[PDB]
From a paper:
Phosphate, a key plant nutrient, is perceived through inositol polyphosphates (InsPs) by SPX domain-containing proteins. The PHR transcription factors are the central regulators of Pi signaling, which bind to the PHR1-binding sequence (P1BS) in the promoter regions of phosphate starvation-induced (PSI) genes. To avoid Pi toxicity caused by excessive Pi accumulation in plants, SPX proteins, on the other hand, bind to PHR proteins and inactivate PHR-induced transcription under Pi-replete conditions. Taken together, our results suggest that, upon sensing the surrogate signals of phosphate, [name] inhibits [name] via a dual mechanism that attenuates dimerization and DNA binding activities of [name].
A highly crystallizable T4 [name] (T4L) was fused to the C-terminus of [name] to facilitate crystallization and improve the quality of crystals. The SPX domain of [name] consists of two long core helices α3 and α4, and two shorter C-terminal helices, α5 and α6. Interestingly, both the MYB domain and CC motif of [name] make direct contact with [name]. One InsP6 molecule participates in crystal-packing interactions, while the other two are each captured by an [name] molecule via a highly basic surface groove formed between helices α1, α2, and α4. Three lysine residues (K29, K147, and K151) and a tyrosine residue (Y25) from [name] contribute to the interaction with InsP6. Remarkably, superposition analysis of our structure and the Arabidopsis PHR1 MYB-DNA complex structure reveals a severe steric hindrance for DNA binding by the [name]-bound [name]-MYB.
Residue numbers in the entry:
A (entry chain A): 248 to 305, 329 to 376
B (entry chain B): 0 to 36, 63 to 357
Write the structure that this text describes.
């Protein structure tokens, strides 16, 4: 698999647009224009299919908007805690390592 | 309590079928541990193979999802940029829903990684307890370096998504500012004086009669309220107060030139001042207003801080002075 970056995808869009768009561009051509390290024909084919998929052409609304505001608020709060959790998981492992270095030396 | 197994399942059930068998096989791994009584027994190597396969499935799924999100982010950013605030009520609702949903899915991938990691630690702990081995520390050191655990560039995508939403689904910046400074009350109360007030400093009447304040509230809202209102009734009432305050400023010779020169943010700080001390009180800061008009931010700050107002309400005054300094909501 290929770790894509927003910068690398931007380059892929340009390459493909320069080759007449997603319905005219070939993976071989995109590969040649991009000249990217470790990028294969397989990666370009897999990336173009996802690109073509994401570009597929075909009470009250105030209450729906208020529901989106809460949906967003709750997603943002979970996101914040997940960032916090990552630091918690790292500290646990750091203390666990120290507890092991201390018991071997007693 | 942690209730890990129950929470992992509750989350898996809330995912689309493509996420089917993408999470940690926690139930399975706990059963395979029971079978464990290179100097490594076949049982131990087979169990370690299951853990490596788990990690492969996590990393392969995460980076594939990151890739989808990179494509989705660019596509949403273009749709938003092309439209340039000219979306219909129908179109604006659609794109907002799609970006809030996209944001949610990225937080879901972040939760997937947190839940998988938590369970991995629980499995290694049970493993080490069962084998007498000490491999949790090197195994988790390996995990803490894997794409799925680090979160990769997912943090940057959530940040970009949130930036599109700060423009597309905005919050009433001045309303949140004054609900912090003056305060938001949904029931008819009495101010510093003996007059009836509601919401964020909205005077109903100077009358001692509670029914005189009630009839004024039913007229302002347009319904039978009984003395209680909702957040949006209080927000629309405040928006009318802001418009009225701006109308007053724009017809004040001592306030209009400086208000016209300030940016939207520093204009909300000036409206805040007007709400607190009145148009006449604010127009009295001749020297400070001159510094603000001349865009001498720091000079205006040092000068506003020596006023009686700064000693009257220091918390509120400092927050307003910082808004004039920075030109941002970073004080609120
Ligand atoms: O958890 P239970 O409600 O008790 O169901 C169990 C259990 O299935 P799961 O744990 O995967 O849900 C297995 O038993 P354990 O390994 O957990 O002890 C299983 O397979 P086993 O032959 O290894 O016991 C067994 O039997 P089966 O799948 O043939 O129905 C089945 O049912 P029981 O409740 O009768 O044990
Ligand atoms: O009885 P349950 O409500 O189903 O919860 C139990 C158990 O609770 P008790 O030990 O108090 O009876 C433990 O819950 P927590 O440790 O999260 O507080 C945990 O068992 P272990 O941690 O000892 O493994 C857990 O299992 P899990 O690790 O999956 O969260 C789970 O048992 P079951 O999931 O098998 O039902």
């Amino acid at each position: 698999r290929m770790r894509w970056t927003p910068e690398l995808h931007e380059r892929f869009v340009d390459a493909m647009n320069l080759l007449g768009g997603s319905e005219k561009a070939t993976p071989k051509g995109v590969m040649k224009l991009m000249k990217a390290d470790n990028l294969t024909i397989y990666h370009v084919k897999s990336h173009m299919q996802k690109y073509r998929t994401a570009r597929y052409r075909p009470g009250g609304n105030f209450d729906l908007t208020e529901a989106l505001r809460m949906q967003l608020e709750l997603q943002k709060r979970l996101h914040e805690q997940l960032e916090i959790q990552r630091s918690l998981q790292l500290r646990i492992e750091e203390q666990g390592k120290c507890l092991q270095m201390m018991l071997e030396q007693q | 309590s942690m209730k890990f197994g129950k929470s992992l399942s509750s989350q898996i059930v809330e995912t689309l079928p493509e996420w089917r068998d993408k999470f940690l096989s926690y139930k399975d791994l706990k059963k395979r541990l029971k079978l464990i009584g290179a100097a490594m027994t076949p049982e131990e190597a087979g169990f370690m193979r299951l853990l490596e396969a788990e990690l492969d499935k996590f990393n392969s799924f995460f980076v594939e999802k990151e890739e989808e999100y990179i494509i989705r982010q660019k596509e949403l950013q273009d749709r938003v940029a092309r439209a340039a605030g000219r979306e219909s009520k129908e179109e604006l609702m659609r794109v907002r829903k799609e970006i809030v949903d996209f944001h949610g899915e990225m937080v879901l991938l972040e939760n997937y990684s947190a839940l998988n990691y938590t369970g991995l630690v629980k499995i290694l702990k049970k493993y080490d307890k069962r084998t007498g081995a000490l491999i949790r520390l090197p195994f988790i050191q390996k995990v803490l370096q894997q794409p799925f655990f680090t979160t990769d560039l997912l943090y940057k995508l959530v940040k970009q998504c949130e930036a599109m939403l700060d423009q597309l689904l905005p919050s009433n910046e001045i309303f949140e500012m004054l609900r912090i400074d003056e305060g938001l009350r949904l029931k008819i109360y009495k101010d510093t004086e003996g007059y009836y007030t509601i919401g964020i400093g909205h005077l109903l009447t100077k009358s001692p009669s509670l029914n005189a304040a009630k009839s004024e509230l039913d007229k302002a809202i347009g319904r039978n309220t009984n003395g209680v209102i909702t957040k949006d009734e209080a927000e629309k009432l405040f928006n009318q107060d802001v418009d009225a305050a701006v109308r007053g400023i724009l017809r004040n010779a001592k306030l209009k030139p400086v208000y016209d020169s300030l940016d939207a943010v520093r204009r909300a700080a000036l409206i805040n001042m007007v709400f607190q001390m009145g148009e006449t009180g604010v127009a009295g800061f001749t020297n400070s207003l001159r510094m603000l008009q001349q865009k001498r931010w720091d000079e205006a700050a040092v000068n506003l801080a020596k006023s009686r107002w700064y000693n009257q309400t220091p918390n509120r005054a400092k927050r307003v002075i910082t808004t004039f300094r920075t030109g941002t909501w970073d004080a609120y």
